[PDB]
Amino acid sequence: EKIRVDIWSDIACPWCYIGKRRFESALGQFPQRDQVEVVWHSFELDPSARPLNPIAMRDGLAMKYSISPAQAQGSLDHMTQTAAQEGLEYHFDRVKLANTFLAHQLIHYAAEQGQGDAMKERLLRAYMSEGQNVNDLDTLQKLAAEVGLDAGAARAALEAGTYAQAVRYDEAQAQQLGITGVPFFVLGGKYGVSGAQAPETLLGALSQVWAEQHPAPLTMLGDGQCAVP
Numbered sequence: 001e002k003i004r005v006d007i008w009s010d011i012a013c014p015w016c017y018i019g020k021r022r023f024e025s026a027l028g029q030f031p032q033r034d035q036v037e038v039v040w041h042s043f044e045l046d047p048s049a050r051p052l053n054p055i056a057m058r059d060g061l062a063m064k065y066s067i068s069p070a071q072a073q074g075s076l077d078h079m080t081q082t083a084a085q086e087g088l089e090y091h092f093d094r095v096k097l098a099n100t101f102l103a104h105q106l107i108h109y110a111a112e113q114g115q116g117d118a119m120k121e122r123l124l125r126a127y128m129s130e131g132q133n134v135n136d137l138d139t140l141q142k143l144a145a146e147v148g149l150d151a152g153a154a155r156a157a158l159e160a161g162t163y164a165q166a167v168r169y170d171e172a173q174a175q176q177l178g179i180t181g182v183p184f185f186v187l188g189g190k191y192g193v194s195g196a197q198a199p200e201t202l203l204g205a206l207s208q209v210w211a212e213q214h215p216a217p218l219t220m221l222g223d224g225q226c227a228v229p
Contacts, residue, residue, distance in 0.1 A: 003036045003209055006186040008043040009120070011100045011134055012089065014079045017124040019087035019183035019196030026202035027077040032210050040111065040120050041103040042170035043182045051135045053097040060097050070217075083128075094131030101167060107142060108163035109154055118147050143158045187214070 007023070009016040026035050053060060062072040080090045103123050110119030122143050126132035132139050137158060144154035157163065174184070185193035185202065188209040193202060 001035060001213075002214070003032070003174075003188055005036060005038045005206075006041055006181050006189075007038065008041045008170070008184040008186075009182050010043045010045050011103050011120075011123045011127050012045055012098070013182050014092075014128055015196045016183045017088055017128055018079070018086055019090065019185075020085050020121070020124065021088065021140060022196055022199045023183075023185070023202050025199035026206060027034065029203050030206045031197065032206075035210075038106060038117060040116050041174065042098055042167040043174050043179070043184075044104065044171060045173065045182070045194075046099075048103070049097070049099040051099050052133060054095065057092045057095040057097060063086045078192065088128070090128050091131060092128075094129075095127065096133040097132060098133050098135035100134060101164070102137070102158055103142060103171075104167045105158055105161070105163040106140050106154060109157045110144070110149055111148070113149060115147055115149060119149070122147050154197070 005023075008017075013071075018075045030036070032127045033132070058072050058076055061067075061075060065072070065075075067075075080092060083090050089206055103225060107116055107119045107123065110116050123134055126139070126143055127134050132143070134140065134143075137155060140158060141151050141155040145151035177186075179194075181195055183192065185205070187193065187205050191205055191209060193205055
């Protein structure tokens with residue numbers, strides 16, 4: 001009697017924060033919201049990224065998509081305004097272009113304490129709005145503390161690379177599934193929703209899945225059978 005939602009996401013993707021808000025709006029409108037299980041999965045836009053790339057986000061975007069810095073800025077402006085409608089105040093001018101592998105590990109650590117979503121949320125805010133470097137261990141330990149985790153233990157887990165493999169397995173699974181962009185939603189292990197779609201769309205998917213798991217009872221009409229006990 002549960003609905004599983006698997007979400008692949010990168011901390012470095014502004015559409016993932018937008019998508020998280022839109023999914024949260026859909027969940028709020030969904031009558032059976034208490035039956036929904038959300039599982040975040042690791043995705044790295046660029047697994048081979050430098051620990052910290054010193055350049056401005058605008059310039060990194062320009063290089064990535066081979067567009068003018070003016071066009072890249074227009075893309076940043078678009079995402080900024082779109083995010084504001086979700087109650088997100090982005091500051092792309094402060095963004096630190098960090099490798100997110102360790103941050104994804106922290107989310108895995110947090111999820112074992114049952115705080116995966118809060119850790120994900122904290123990291124998205126730290127990256128998109130607060131100009132924090134999510135590759136930096138001090139920073140990650142601090143964010144873990146703010147979420148209410150054992151900050152000493154979290155940092156120990158990060159330095160040990162305890163969840164490094166769990167993160168790579170997440171990314172492999174996305175690759176196997178053909179997920180090449182984020183956010184990506186999987187509902188009931190069957191349905192896929194690509195990108196940060198409208199709450200109405202995600203609500204529709206939730207509703208469709210619930211409906212399929214709870215079909216109308218048949219009218220039984222009044223010499224044996226094989227039953228599985």
